[PDB]
Design a protein around this motif. Structure first.
Motif, PDB file in Angstrom:
ATOM      1  N   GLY A 173       0.778  -1.216   0.000  1.00 20.01           N
ATOM      2  CA  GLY A 173       0.000   0.000   0.000  1.00 20.01           C
ATOM      3  C   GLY A 173       0.814   1.272   0.000  1.00 20.01           C
ATOM      4  N   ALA A 174       2.125   1.182   0.197  1.00 18.32           N
ATOM      5  CA  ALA A 174       2.991   2.341   0.086  1.00 18.32           C
ATOM      6  C   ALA A 174       3.184   2.717  -1.379  1.00 18.32           C
ATOM      7  N   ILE A 175       3.460   4.001  -1.610  1.00 16.37           N
ATOM      8  CA  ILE A 175       3.568   4.494  -2.980  1.00 16.37           C
ATOM      9  C   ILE A 175       4.763   3.866  -3.682  1.00 16.37           C
ATOM     10  N   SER A 176       5.731   3.378  -2.915  1.00 17.07           N
ATOM     11  CA  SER A 176       6.908   2.740  -3.481  1.00 17.07           C
ATOM     12  C   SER A 176       7.321   1.592  -2.572  1.00 17.07           C
ATOM     13  N   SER A 177       8.084   0.658  -3.133  1.00 24.67           N
ATOM     14  CA  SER A 177       8.579  -0.484  -2.378  1.00 24.67           C
ATOM     15  C   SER A 177      10.075  -0.390  -2.109  1.00 24.67           C
ATOM     16  N   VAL A 178      10.696   0.732  -2.456  1.00 20.59           N
ATOM     17  CA  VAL A 178      12.103   0.981  -2.172  1.00 20.59           C
ATOM     18  C   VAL A 178      12.174   2.142  -1.191  1.00 20.59           C
ATOM     19  N   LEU A 179      13.044   2.015  -0.188  1.00 20.76           N
ATOM     20  CA  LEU A 179      13.131   3.039   0.846  1.00 20.76           C
ATOM     21  C   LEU A 179      13.512   4.388   0.266  1.00 20.76           C
ATOM     22  N   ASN A 180      14.483   4.407  -0.645  1.00 17.48           N
ATOM     23  CA  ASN A 180      15.092   5.659  -1.078  1.00 17.48           C
ATOM     24  C   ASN A 180      14.092   6.557  -1.798  1.00 17.48           C
ATOM     25  N   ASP A 181      13.223   5.977  -2.629  1.00 17.45           N
ATOM     26  CA  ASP A 181      12.205   6.779  -3.296  1.00 17.45           C
ATOM     27  C   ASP A 181      11.181   7.338  -2.317  1.00 17.45           C
ATOM     28  N   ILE A 182      11.073   6.753  -1.126  1.00 16.26           N
ATOM     29  CA  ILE A 182      10.187   7.294  -0.101  1.00 16.26           C
ATOM     30  C   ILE A 182      10.884   8.394   0.685  1.00 16.26           C
ATOM     31  N   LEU A 183      12.094   8.110   1.170  1.00 11.28           N
ATOM     32  CA  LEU A 183      12.827   9.077   1.982  1.00 11.28           C
ATOM     33  C   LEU A 183      13.140  10.334   1.184  1.00 11.28           C
ATOM     34  N   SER A 184      13.747  10.174   0.015  1.00 14.24           N
ATOM     35  CA  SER A 184      13.757  11.259  -0.947  1.00 14.24           C
ATOM     36  C   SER A 184      12.360  11.408  -1.529  1.00 14.24           C
ATOM     37  N   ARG A 185      12.094  12.570  -2.121  1.00 14.02           N
ATOM     38  CA  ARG A 185      10.871  12.835  -2.867  1.00 14.02           C
ATOM     39  C   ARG A 185       9.655  12.982  -1.960  1.00 14.02           C
ATOM     40  N   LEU A 186       9.800  12.802  -0.647  1.00 16.11           N
ATOM     41  CA  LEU A 186       8.697  12.998   0.281  1.00 16.11           C
ATOM     42  C   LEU A 186       9.165  13.791   1.490  1.00 16.11           C
ATOM     43  N   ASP A 187       8.293  14.632   1.968  1.00 16.05           N
ATOM     44  CA  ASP A 187       8.464  15.341   3.220  1.00 16.05           C
ATOM     45  C   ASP A 187       7.825  14.553   4.358  1.00 16.05           C
ATOM     46  N   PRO A 188       8.379  14.654   5.563  1.00 16.16           N
ATOM     47  CA  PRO A 188       7.945  13.791   6.674  1.00 16.16           C
ATOM     48  C   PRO A 188       6.448  13.850   6.944  1.00 16.16           C
ATOM     49  N   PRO A 189       5.767  15.025   6.796  1.00 24.21           N
ATOM     50  CA  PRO A 189       4.304  15.047   6.981  1.00 24.21           C
ATOM     51  C   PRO A 189       3.547  13.819   6.483  1.00 24.21           C
ATOM     52  N   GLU A 190       3.868  13.322   5.285  1.00 24.31           N
ATOM     53  CA  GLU A 190       3.293  12.076   4.791  1.00 24.31           C
ATOM     54  C   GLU A 190       4.307  10.951   4.635  1.00 24.31           C
ATOM     55  N   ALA A 191       5.601  11.273   4.597  1.00 25.95           N
ATOM     56  CA  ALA A 191       6.616  10.228   4.586  1.00 25.95           C
ATOM     57  C   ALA A 191       6.533   9.371   5.836  1.00 25.95           C
ATOM     58  N   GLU A 192       6.141   9.961   6.969  1.00 21.82           N
ATOM     59  CA  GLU A 192       5.972   9.177   8.186  1.00 21.82           C
ATOM     60  C   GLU A 192       4.968   8.055   7.968  1.00 21.82           C
ATOM     61  N   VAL A 193       3.791   8.381   7.424  1.00 17.64           N
ATOM     62  CA  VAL A 193       2.756   7.363   7.266  1.00 17.64           C
ATOM     63  C   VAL A 193       3.125   6.363   6.177  1.00 17.64           C
ATOM     64  N   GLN A 194       3.735   6.816   5.078  1.00 21.18           N
ATOM     65  CA  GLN A 194       4.124   5.872   4.031  1.00 21.18           C
ATOM     66  C   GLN A 194       5.173   4.893   4.548  1.00 21.18           C
ATOM     67  N   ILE A 195       6.182   5.416   5.247  1.00 23.91           N
ATOM     68  CA  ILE A 195       7.237   4.584   5.798  1.00 23.91           C
ATOM     69  C   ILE A 195       6.674   3.668   6.869  1.00 23.91           C
ATOM     70  N   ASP A 196       5.699   4.147   7.646  1.00 17.98           N
ATOM     71  CA  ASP A 196       5.072   3.311   8.663  1.00 17.98           C
ATOM     72  C   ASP A 196       4.326   2.146   8.033  1.00 17.98           C
ATOM     73  N   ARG A 197       3.611   2.401   6.935  1.00 12.80           N
ATOM     74  CA  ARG A 197       2.941   1.317   6.222  1.00 12.80           C
ATOM     75  C   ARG A 197       3.946   0.290   5.722  1.00 12.80           C
ATOM     76  N   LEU A 198       5.047   0.758   5.133  1.00 11.41           N
ATOM     77  CA  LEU A 198       6.055  -0.172   4.629  1.00 11.41           C
ATOM     78  C   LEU A 198       6.717  -0.947   5.763  1.00 11.41           C
ATOM     79  N   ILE A 199       6.980  -0.280   6.888  1.00 12.56           N
ATOM     80  CA  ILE A 199       7.581  -0.939   8.044  1.00 12.56           C
ATOM     81  C   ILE A 199       6.646  -2.001   8.588  1.00 12.56           C
ATOM     82  N   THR A 200       5.357  -1.679   8.701  1.00 15.17           N
ATOM     83  CA  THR A 200       4.393  -2.658   9.184  1.00 15.17           C
ATOM     84  C   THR A 200       4.345  -3.868   8.268  1.00 15.17           C
TER      85      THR A 200
END
Ligand SMILES: *[C@@H]1O[C@H](CO)[C@@H](O)[C@H](O)[C@H]1NC(C)=O
Ligand SMILES: *[C@@H]1O[C@H](CO)[C@@H](O)[C@H](O)[C@H]1NC(C)=O
Ligand SMILES: *[C@@H]1O[C@H](CO)[C@@H](O)[C@H](O)[C@H]1NC(C)=O
Ligand SMILES: *[C@@H]1O[C@H](CO)[C@@H](O)[C@H](O)[C@H]1NC(C)=O
Ligand SMILES: *[C@@H]1O[C@H](CO)[C@@H](O)[C@H](O)[C@H]1NC(C)=O
Ligand SMILES: *[C@@H]1O[C@H](CO)[C@@H](O)[C@H](O)[C@H]1NC(C)=O
Ligand SMILES: *[C@@H]1O[C@H](CO)[C@@H](O)[C@H](O)[C@H]1NC(C)=O
Lengths: 48, 205, 112, 373, 114, 48, 48
Positions: free
Chosen positions: F1-28
């Motif tokens: 359900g995350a917009i990407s399956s690679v960490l780097n495309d999430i950490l880059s290209r996203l600001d924490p406001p929504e990077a937190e939730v995307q990364i949390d989904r991927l971590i879960t």
């Protein structure tokens, strides 16, 4: 935690984005239930 | 008359290199072991119009390069903008201009986009996905004049010109002073077998 | 925030071209200046808005120039019926220098 | 906890006394030495300015669309400007777009009115979202809306741009309909031009300068990006630096933005293929854009760290063990006088003995270390 | 398309007064509106404006807290005034638009005297 | 359900406001996968 | 035919031809202001 337990009833009464999120909650729940089922079955099958 | 295309029609789905990898890709390909329309151009004999249907596999085997162009348009009769392909010795011509053509247009021996680039069998696959017109090719030598032989030679992409015009009909251009086969593509998952060199030596549908 | 109408009074002839200068203390918000002609005893009518764009149904004699801090109005001619005070309505990036402001009057007299 | 390996063993064991044995305390990954950035070299200046600054953009139903290629992706210059009232990119963030760089860009512009800006978003329902333009529920792009009263709106009714009030069905994402054919409702009897329950689907928009914010000309440009598998042609204004070989480094090859060491690659890429991948779909090759060569991205060396000590009742002397790392890259421990290499890994702090004894602390790969004179 | 004001009368200083402009042929839920005053021998100045979403916040700096604007129903907007003074005498026009206006009502004068 | 399956495309290209939730989904998701792997491996290691 | 309501009120009266627009919501006139006024949030159909 979803709106309803019936997938078709979620498809109705809901525009497709909320359908995605609620069905995602339902899939998480049912996948957890199925993982618990297969894990309990793996343990019980180890016992058998 | 029909024909049995054995295995050909397999191309690289994307520019990602994989080495010794069996990457199964679901994509619009040519189904294996499917009947194919046989067409004639010698002797008279002319070329008809065939539908596109989400991609056409065009395999024309020529000696003097009688095949000279392609037409891809929903109307292709100056009614609306239509893709136009003309293969010439000087250069490769791709237009979008509206032109009016007869039922049997013969060759002597507004435009939105533009581009300039039987021993012979030039394989081709034309498809429109995500508004992208993708063209592939292969020029493997064949020594069987009757029909395409059993075997497998993959197709390498050439140009990804984003035409942006929907294509539902298809026509071929010839030369007059030579058969060609036309298949169809439909969504079928495959299992490509990549080689150590990076070429798809085998595939299963 | 107060816009200065320099000169306050303008005199011009019927066939004489009319010009006026309305200066804004601060920069306007995305070219939001307007102009209205206030005949006595009646609320003003629109003549030019967004500096130069002409409203529908007005005479083809008003043309506006300038942007940012300085703006000006130019009228090709007067048919003796444009004797009214002009107010340059200065839209501002609101919550800074009030939210919008009106300038002083600039009436045009015709000598006959 | 980090004074020395014995202190780390004490902390992880949560005990001031450490029994004889081998305890894993941390993981030693060789940190990157520097940063390298490579992509196509200053191909051309992007016409992104002409996307927003153009005189006119088309209507909502027949929305224009421009394609960006052979470009410099100067993104944050748009974010910093305050003229852009709405810049809520849903799939990405506009402050980090220069860092990454993508295959292709679609800059399609369509003017909707005021509050209808929120109507275009991943998974929204409304008039525009259903009948004129729907963004995909999984959208990765920016939405750049700003007030455009000064040009679009005019007194007496700005009827240039239109919208579909009635459509027979919903809209597939990114689909443009320009049929503008008369639509019938109810008993659908209007086979002609005009009839009951039969009207033109396109009613002209109305923009007047004397309008509220929610019903104001709000010109929208929504950029869209696709994932990087094909080679990228639009990439931002980043400074390119010389690559390194056989040296661990943070790399940004055409937006990969990953870390690793770049050995020489004996694999031959066919000219059309750009990127590489492993058996398990992880990046294991890359074609450098400036120099068309192949260089295997083997991972930066890493492995567990195990402290091999006798009991604290015996001695405070410890010997660390960098597992599965060749001893050359270890320093990137204070007791560097003696360094040992084995299949288990760099065993620092212990000196090899040609004799053989019964195992006390099992190191691995058939060697055991003990504390002895 | 017309607007008409009402509520102008002689009122002693320090007493509240209610003004109202009504829209004929259209509802005050699509077209922007503004409230303005023009003294008999002084320039024109604006006080309040509200339309569509809650927009009452935008008020004149000199107006301060004694000026409020609210639309009782769709077609009528009322103006409430407090702390009347001799300097508040002016003609009240119901403007239509924030930065650009099309047409206003005739205007009801509100004189303040004791 | 995350917009990407690679960490780097999430950490880059996203600001924490929504990077937190995307990364949390991927971590879960990845933690669920790792938990599944270790539970299956624990059952298999009991078998071994 | 696909919507449900708690109750429905049918209001019958006689007006002449040009007074039909008065019954339309958000309108003004002698009939609308003195005979039969309709809410601006009206949810229903007017038949004549
Ligand atoms: C289609 O190809 C199959 C191949 O088995 C063949 O049996 C069938 O007759 C073909 N269809 C025709 C000739 O219409
Ligand atoms: C790859 O291609 C080279 C060059 O033609 C050839 O020598 C080699 O046999 C091919 N196959 C493999 C598996 O390397
Ligand atoms: C600049 O860009 C070109 C693009 O083809 C690249 O090949 C070349 O190496 C670059 N040259 C310099 C001097 O930076
Ligand atoms: C449009 O032109 C102006 C000229 O002042 C410039 O400042 C602005 O950046 C341009 N807009 C874009 C989107 O390039
Ligand atoms: C603690 O260390 C001493 C060192 O003399 C050793 O002899 C002893 O066996 C150790 N204690 C235990 C319980 O192993
Ligand atoms: C580096 O150490 C590894 C074991 O960790 C070994 O396999 C390799 O041969 C060593 N390299 C050299 C150059 O000796
Ligand atoms: C151990 O034996 C090896 C093999 O003969 C020899 O190289 C080495 O010098 C000897 N001594 C030590 C202390 O390793």
């Amino acid at each position: 935690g979803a709106i309803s337990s019936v997938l078709n009833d979620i498809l109705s009464r809901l525009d497709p984005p909320e359908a995605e999120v609620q069905i995602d909650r339902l899939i998480t729940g049912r996948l957890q239930s199925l993982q618990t089922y297969v894990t309990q079955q793996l343990i019980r099958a180890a016992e058998i | 008359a029909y024909t049995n295309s054995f295995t050909r029609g397999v191309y690289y789905p994307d520019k990602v290199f994989r080495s010794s990898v069996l990457h199964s890709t679901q994509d619009l390909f040519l189904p294996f072991f499917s009947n194919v329309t046989w067409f004639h151009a010698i002797h008279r004999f002319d070329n008809p119009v065939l539908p596109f249907n989400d991609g056409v596999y065009f395999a024309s085997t020529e000696k003097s390069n009688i095949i000279r162009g392609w037409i891809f348009g929903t109307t292709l009769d100056s009614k609306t903008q239509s893709l136009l392909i003309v293969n010439n010795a000087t250069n490769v011509v791709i237009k979008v201009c509206e032109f009016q053509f007869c039922n049997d247009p013969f060759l002597g021996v507004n435009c939105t986009f533009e581009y300039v680039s039987f021993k012979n069998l030039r394989e081709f696959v034309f498809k429109n996905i995500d508004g992208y017109f993708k063209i592939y090719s292969k020029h493997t030598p064949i020594n069987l004049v009757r029909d395409l032989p059993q075997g497998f030679s993959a197709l390498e992409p050439l140009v990804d010109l984003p035409i942006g015009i929907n294509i539902t009909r298809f026509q071929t251009l010839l030369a007059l002073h030579a058969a060609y086969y036309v298949g169809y593509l439909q969504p079928r998952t495959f299992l490509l077998k990549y080689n150590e060199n990076g070429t798809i030596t085998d595939a299963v549908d | 925030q107060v816009l200065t109408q320099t000169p306050s009074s303008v005199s011009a002839a019927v066939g004489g071209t009319v010009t006026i200068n309305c200066q804004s203390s601060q920069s306007v918000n995305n070219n939001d200046l307007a102009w209205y002609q206030q005949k006595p005893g009646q609320p003003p009518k629109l003549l030019i808005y967004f500096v130069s764009t002409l409203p529908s149904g007005v005479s083809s004699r008003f043309k506006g120039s300038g942007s940012g801090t300085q703006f000006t109005l130019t009228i090709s001619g007067v048919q003796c019926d444009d004797a009214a005070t002009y107010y340059c309505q200065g839209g501002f990036g609101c919550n800074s220098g009030d939210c919008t402001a009106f300038g002083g009057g600039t009436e045009v007299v015709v000598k006959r | 906890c980090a004074l020395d390996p014995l202190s780390e063993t004490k902390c992880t064991l949560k005990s001031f006394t450490v029994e004889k044995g081998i305890y894993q305390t941390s993981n030693f990954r060789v940190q990157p030495t520097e940063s390298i950035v490579r992509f196509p070299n200053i191909t051309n200046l992007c016409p992104f300015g002409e996307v927003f600054n153009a005189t006119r953009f088309a209507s909502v139903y027949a929305w224009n669309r421009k394609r960006i290629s052979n470009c410099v992706a100067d993104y944050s210059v748009l974010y910093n400007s305050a003229s852009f009232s709405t810049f809520k990119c849903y799939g990405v963030s506009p402050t980090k777009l220069n860092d990454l760089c993508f295959t292709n860009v679609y800059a399609d512009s369509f003017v909707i009115r005021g509050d209808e800006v929120r109507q275009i978003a991943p998974g929204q329902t409304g008039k525009i979202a259903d009948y004129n333009y729907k963004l995909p529920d999984d959208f990765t792009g920016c939405v750049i809306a700003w007030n455009s009263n000064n040009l679009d709106s005019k007194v007496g009714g700005n009827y240039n741009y239109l919208y579909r009030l009635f459509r027979k069905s919903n809209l597939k994402p990114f689909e443009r309909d320009i049929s503008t054919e008369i639509y019938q409702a109810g008993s659908t009897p209007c086979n002609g031009v005009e009839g009951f329950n039969c009207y033109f689907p396109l009613q002209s928009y109305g923009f007047q300068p004397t309008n509220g914010v929610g019903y104001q000309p709000y010109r929208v440009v929504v950029l869209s990006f696709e994932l990087l598998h094909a080679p990228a042609t639009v990439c931002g204004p980043k400074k390119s630096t010389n690559l390194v070989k056989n040296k661990c480094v943070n790399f940004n090859f055409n937006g990969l933005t990953g870390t690793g060491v770049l050995t020489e690659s004996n694999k031959k890429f066919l000219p059309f293929q750009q990127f590489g991948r492993d058996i398990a779909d992880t990046t294991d090759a890359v074609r450098d854009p400036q120099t068309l060569e192949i260089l295997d991205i083997t991972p930066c060396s890493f492995g567990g760290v195990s402290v091999i000590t006798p009991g604290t009742n015996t001695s405070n002397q410890v010997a660390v063990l960098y597992q599965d790392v060749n001893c050359t890259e270890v320093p990137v421990y204070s007791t560097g006088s003696n360094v040992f290499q084995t299949r288990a890994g760099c065993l620092i702090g212990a000196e090899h003995v040609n004799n053989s004894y019964e195992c006390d602390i099992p190191i691995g790969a058939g060697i055991c270390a003990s504390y002895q004179t | 398309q017309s607007l008409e004001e009402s509520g102008g009368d002689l009122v002693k200083p320090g007493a509240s007064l209610t003004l109202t402009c009504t829209a004929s042929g259209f509802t005050f839920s699509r077209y922007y509106m503004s409230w303005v005053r023009q003294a008999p021998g002084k320039g024109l100045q604006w006080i309040g404006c509200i339309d569509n979403t809650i927009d009452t916040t935008y008020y004149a700096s000199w107006a301060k807290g004694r000026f409020t604007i609210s639309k009782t129903s769709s077609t009528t907007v009322t103006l409430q005034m407090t702390s009347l003074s001799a300097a508040d005498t002016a003609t009240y026009f119901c403007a239509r638009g924030m930065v650009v206006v099309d047409l206003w009502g005739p205007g009801t004068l509100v004189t303040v005297s004791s």
